[PDB]
Amino acid sequence: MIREERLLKVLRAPHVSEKASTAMEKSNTIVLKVAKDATKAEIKAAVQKLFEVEVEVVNTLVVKGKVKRHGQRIGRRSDWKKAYVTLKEGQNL
């Protein structure tokens, strides 16, 4: 009725591993599985209740390139997000 806790339940995972974790998962700029359409809204205002970030650029991108999860069997790719936002702060960890 004015906002929903439903998209304050958006956390699903921070990305990790090799290159692109460097300030891409830390500092300003953070990348993480965020809902499925995000909302570009309570994904920038649920960290504005947590770091106060009005978020330097709220971005989205659904995440792509090949099935696996038994890539030598048949694979399945359910698809997900990299948030790939830039936060405007990152300092209250």
């Binding site: 806790e5 304050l8 339940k9 956390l11 699903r12 995972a13 921070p14």
Partner: protein, 63 residues
């Protein structure tokens, strides 16, 4: 089977939902997202617990 809970009213079902559905994936299903569970069994009753919230909402009419 048959033999559980105590039933829950919908003036306090309220409170339950803010702890195992919300702000619980920010600490336990964020920390599922940050592992270290040799207590796998605890997680399964964050689910099956608020799954009883809405059973005792539609079954019992919020009672």
């Amino acid at each position: 089977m048959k033999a559980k809970e105590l039933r829950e009213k919908s003036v306090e079902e309220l409170n339950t939902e803010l702890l195992n559905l919300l702000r619980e994936q920010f600490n336990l299903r964020m920390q599922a997202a940050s592992g270290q569970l040799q207590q796998s069994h605890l997680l399964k009753q964050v689910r099956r617990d608020v799954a009883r919230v809405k059973t005792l909402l539609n079954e019992k009419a919020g009672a």
